[PDB]
């Protein structure tokens, strides 16, 4: 009759800030109501940035702990001490500089989408490529991106936690 409920948390009404977004029509999981207090566009931007970063980080850890190593004597360090040896070596600051450039332009994207100067969607950066033309295909692809991002966030969290606890490669 009313108060469209969260399909994930069935005892809490879905936050109206979730309407029109990818993960709302099937999950709608906002129990703490962050979207009620924070701008849902910013939250989606943060979620997708985290998901993409974690999806890169998970495969990076997989490669580094499987023996995939760049051809250099300085690069022959384990993943645990990788982000101390590479910090001292220099490339960590280099990656920081380039990601800082990319993130400054991402800041421009965010501070242009909020004022309406662009019709840019939160996670959108313009990379269509493997993007369906049909709207249903676009929605399903965005849902796949979000689910993979969340899964890899949790996966990388577990990977780093278990690797620090018990120093091993990855299957543990």
């Amino acid at each position: 009759g009313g108060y469209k409920m969260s399909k994930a948390v069935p005892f809490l009404p879905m936050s109206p800030a979730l309407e029109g977004y990818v993960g709302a029509e099937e999950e709608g999981f906002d129990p703490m109501g962050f979207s009620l207090a924070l701008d849902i566009r910013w939250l989606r931007e943060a979620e997708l940035k985290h998901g993409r970063i974690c999806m890169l980080a998970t495969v990076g850890w997989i490669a580094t702990d499987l023996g995939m190593r760049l051809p250099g004597p300085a690069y022959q360090v384990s993943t645990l001490e990788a982000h101390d040896a590479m910090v001292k070596f220099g490339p960590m600051a280099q990656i920081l500089i380039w990601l800082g450039i990319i993130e400054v332009f991402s800041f421009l994207a965010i501070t242009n989408m909020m004022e309406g100067t662009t019709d840019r969607q939160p996670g959108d950066y313009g990379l269509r490529r493997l993007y369906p033309k049909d709207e249903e295909g676009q929605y399903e692809m965005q849902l796949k991106e979000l689910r993979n991002g969340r899964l890899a966030m949790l996966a990388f969290s577990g990977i780093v936690t278990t690797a620090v606890l018990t120093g091993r490669t990855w299957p543990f």
Binding site: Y3, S15, A17, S35, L36, A37, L38, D39, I40, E115
Partner: protein, 70 residues
Amino acid sequence: RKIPAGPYSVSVEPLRDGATNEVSIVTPPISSEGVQEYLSLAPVFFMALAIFTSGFAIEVLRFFPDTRYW
């Protein structure tokens, strides 16, 4: 706004009926034009200029200690 609340308030009016599933973003409604205008203030602009000048002098003193080339 019958309930006395301060100017520039992100608070919904506390005189509401039964529990409302509404979106009340608690973040300042700032503006990019407004932020740029604020950072262009004489105090902000001139303190930034002073910080830039001081840091430039710091770096010149670090990489060229003393007046060796007098």
